[model samples]
Target: GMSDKFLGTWKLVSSENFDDYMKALGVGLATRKLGNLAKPTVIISKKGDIITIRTESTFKNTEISFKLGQEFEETTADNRKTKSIVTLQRGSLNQVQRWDGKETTIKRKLVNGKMVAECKMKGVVCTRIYEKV
Candidate 1:
């Protein structure tokens, strides 16, 4: 299955435009500073019809579990109450989030054997690279 490629633990390697992306998401300066300082680790797994993704860091830990194409309530890392969904599309995990009349998207894919996360919002794009451990 396509999901097999993402079933592993990955450590943060690098990030680009993350500050601006957070700004677009309405994250405050204090939180953004803390976010920049934390080196997060991403863990992904699957069971039966459910897929789970967890991100752990010194600042905060975020865990999300969902079935493909299903919608669920999500409290974002920055504390935004949002409706989120994850779908498998073209060998990537595509996540769409809607909150307070705004929306954002995150795409996770395997590139060069690394987990690459691309976050988008309000014309802002941020990239985070993760190396499997």
Candidate 2:
């Protein structure tokens, strides 16, 4: 499966452009400040065709279970109850989240033995790097 490479636990190593990205998502200053400084762990698992991606942070944890290309309601850690869908394109697990009149994209990919997560909302982009654990 396309997600095979990413199916494991990854520990956060670094984060970039998180402040502006959180601002774009409308997260509060206090929350973003904490979340930006804390390390988060990501867990990816699969059963049959359903895949679950869980993110554990110091302030919050969020998880989602879905099959490829399926639409699901996701309650994000940022407190946005939104609609989300994930699909495999090329080698990346690309996800889109939509709420109210806003939408953002998150992509996870394995590169050079590291799992890289990228979040983008128009101009602002957040990148988090993780190492397999």
Candidate 3:
């Protein structure tokens, strides 16, 4: 089940191209610098029909809550407001967000006992790895 597979805390292990990814999203220099340095942790929880994903770090803490396939408003850590939709299929969770008339997608999948999250925007792709804690 989607909930069963994702309901746990995951600690960030490594990241690649995240700085470039943030740059593509128009994040400012100071914020992108902090984002690249913060090793945030993620917690996913599902209750009934709602799913919530929370990110925790010394620099920022953010939570996003929604139902599958439903579009909602989301404000990212960089303060970008997006129309966001999340989908789950084939053991992968995918999120598409539209902001500033542009679209960005993020996909999360469990691979080899770890969670791999890929964020793509403006021809830049960022990969982040997390281990279940």
Q: What lDDT is obtained when candidate 3 is compared to the true structure?
A: 0.92
At residue 88, candidate 1 shows an lDDT of: 77
Name the TM-score of candidate 3: 0.96
Model 1 per-residue lDDT tens digits across residues 82-113: 99999878889999999989999999999989
TM-scores, all candidates, are 0.97, 0.97, 0.96
Clashing pairs for model 1 are: none
lDDT of 2 by residue, 14-79 (tens): 899988999999988999889888788999999999999999976899899999999999999888
Task: Provide the overall lDDT of each model, using Cα atoms, as 2-decimal numbers.
Answer: 0.92, 0.91, 0.92
**Model 3: per-residue Cα lDDT over 1-133, one tens digit each:** 4747778999999999999999999988999899999999999998888999999999999999999999999999888899999998888999999987999999999998799999999899999999999
Candidate 1 Cα errors over 4 Å, as ranges:
none
What's the lDDT for residue 14 in model 3?
99
| Reference-based lDDT, residue 84, model 2 | 94
The true-structure Cα RMSD of candidate 1 reads: 0.8
Candidate 1, lDDT over the whole model: 0.92
Clashes of 3: 0
- Indicate which candidate wins on TM-score: 1
Candidate 3 residue spans exceeding 4 A from truth? 1-3
